[PDB]
Amino acid sequence: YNVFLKWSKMNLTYRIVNYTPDMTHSEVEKAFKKAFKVWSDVTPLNFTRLHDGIADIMISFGIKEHGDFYPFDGPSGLLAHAFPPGPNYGGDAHFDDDETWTSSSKGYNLFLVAAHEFGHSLGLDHSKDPGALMFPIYTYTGKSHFMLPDDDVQGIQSLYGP
Ligand SMILES: CC(C)[C@H](NS(=O)(=O)c1ccc(-c2ccc(NC(=O)c3cc4ccccc4o3)cc2)cc1)C(=O)O
Ligand SMILES: [Ca+2]
Ligand SMILES: [Ca+2]
Ligand SMILES: [Ca+2]
Ligand SMILES: [Zn+2]
Ligand SMILES: [Zn+2]
After folding, report:
1. Hey, which end of the chain has fewer CB within 10 Å, N or C?
2. Are 95 and 113 in contact (CB under 8 A)?
3. What residue ranges line ligand 1, CB within 6 angstroms?
4. Which residue's CA is minimally distant from atom 3 of ligand 1?
């Protein structure tokens, strides 16, 4: 794993500011929740969704320039990114809506990206282990279950413990 500063608290909050047209509000909510559980199952980190106001990790769907000068690029290329732990933009996660998001395989599986992105949100950088979730390349397994690779368990736990 690779770490460049982690959250001083274990109970973090998150808010879904907007939704992509590719999935139902429910599909999106289910995918992010599951993504958060990936890290919550292996550390003491707890996540609570908020509906209004500012949360630690604000989740939004955008295109091109969307408020942080880290513009997206339309179809292909970048699909999403997040800021490391910290206030305001820190930990926030943005998803390029010029990409097709899905709960399955026809496009970018939202759960898998979001899980990868909340890795950054929590303080993790890219892995050198090709089978790691935090590896810089996205992949679909075609399998229903997702077990966080031992490497990311090691990485995440090196910052928050078991
Ligand atoms: C720095 C900025 C510019 C960069 N932005 S980017 O738009 O280029 C970008 C964003 C996310 C990814 C990405 C990488 C890896 C995954 N992981 C998996 O799919 C995955 C599935 C999977 C299944 C079993 C075991 C491990 C696994 O890992 C999921 C998504 C790849 C590239 C970044 O945040 O990575
Ligand atoms: Ca793109
Ligand atoms: Ca934030
Ligand atoms: Ca889209
Ligand atoms: Zn952004
Ligand atoms: Zn990444």
Report:
1. C
2. yes
3. 78-81, 112-113, 116, 120, 131, 133, 135-139, 141, 149
4. 81
Burial 115-124 (b: 16+ CB within 10 A, else e): bbbbbbbbbb
Domain with 22, as residue range(s), is 1-162
Q: Which residues are catalytic?
A: 117
Look-up of token digits 């679909």: 140
Ligand 4 geometric centre to CA of 20 (Å): 6
What is the domain count for the chain? Answer: 1
Query: Is residue 152 a known part of a binding site?
Result: no
Question: Residue 119 belongs to a domain with what CATH number?
Answer: 3.40.390.10
Residue whose CB lies within 8 A of the most ligand 1 atoms, among 104, 112, 122, for a mutation test: 112
The angstrom resolution of this structure is: 2.0
